[PDB]
Design a protein. Structure first.
Lengths: 131, 136, 43
């Protein structure tokens, strides 16, 4: 199913056709969009599906998730080889994250590093993530 | 019980066969609850035009003996964060018209008119009512 | 040194959505059963 509509369905945890509060931001971030703090402050109390689809359609018209995510990863590309350290990402996910268990983190890291190279191609990873 | 089944099938039949669409209605009148997944699965081997023997086979494989109150209740309770056992009519409508095999607005409005009194639905009692009258 | 927090937020939200998908898939068959019985009652 299309990604935005599925994200709405997945983060409408009450099943009331409304996404509200943290879930709202989560829904947005689940599609690979990092809204600015101004955009976060401007978000309404809650959104029904028309509101959410309009917000995401207008956002994606000026914001490409793939390129922004690869751009965020490249800030930690020390070797400048299209790679980031797997254990660094693991540690920061565990230190700053609030939603994911440790097993989920570990699973993600094995995904991004299937050969256990200790590196993550992140470009290939973001691509084979955003399908 | 069987003669009325035969007669109801044949009143809808053309050249001895009925659409699987009409077979859904006939099965429901018989007291069975087939899904659209059942319809597609049966069409995969038998097509979408059934003579009486094939309709009997479709009926025989749509009894869903796995149905039970607890699994339906847990499916609904997934959307009940407080887990106190209630869902609003807004919640019931959105859930039933969004997930699984979504109801049309007409289907849900008929359901709500007959079964929803207050704005707070005890979905356990609702699921129990939904399981009633199934032909066993 | 930049901050990992935006990237972490995105990845956490994405995989929380994946978890939501798994758990909702566990319940969808019985939503379908409920809808089938509703349609039986409505015939």
């Amino acid at each position: 199913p299309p990604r935005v509509r599925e994200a709405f369905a997945l983060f409408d945890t009450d099943g009331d056709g409304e996404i509200s509060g943290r879930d709202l931001v989560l829904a947005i971030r689940s599609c690979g969009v990092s809204p600015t703090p101004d955009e976060i402050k401007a978000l309404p109390m809650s959104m029904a599906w028309p509101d959410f689809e309009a917000w995401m359609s207008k956002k994606l018209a000026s914001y490409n998730p793939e390129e922004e995510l690869i751009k965020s990863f490249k800030a930690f590309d020390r070797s400048n080889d299209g790679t980031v350290s797997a254990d660094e990402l693991s540690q920061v996910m565990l230190a700053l994250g609030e939603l994911l268990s440790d097993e989920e983190v570990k699973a993600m890291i094995k995904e991004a590093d299937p050969n256990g190279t200790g590196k993550i191609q992140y470009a290939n990873f973001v691509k084979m993530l955003l399908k | 019980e069987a003669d009325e089944m035969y007669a109801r099938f044949n009143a809808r039949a053309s050249g001895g066969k009925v659409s699987t669409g009409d077979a859904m209605i006939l099965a429901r009148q018989l007291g069975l609850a087939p899904s659209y997944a059942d319809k597609q699965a049966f069409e995969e081997k038998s097509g979408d035009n059934l003579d009486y023997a094939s309709f009997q086979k479709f009926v025989g494989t749509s009894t869903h003996p796995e149905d039970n109150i607890e699994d339906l209740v847990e499916a609904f309770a997934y959307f009940d964060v407080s887990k106190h056992g209630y869902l609003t009519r807004k919640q019931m409508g959105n859930i039933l018209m969004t997930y699984g095999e979504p109801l049309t607005t007409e289907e849900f409005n008929a359901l709500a008119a007959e079964y929803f009194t207050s704005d707070q639905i005890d979905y356990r009692q609702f699921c129990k009512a939904m399981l009633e009258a199934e032909n066993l | 040194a930049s901050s990992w927090e935006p990237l972490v937020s995105v990845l956490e939200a994405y995989y929380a959505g994946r978890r939501h998908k798994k758990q909702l898939l566990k319940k969808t068959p019985f939503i379908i059963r409920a809808q089938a019985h509703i349609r039986r009652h409505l015939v």
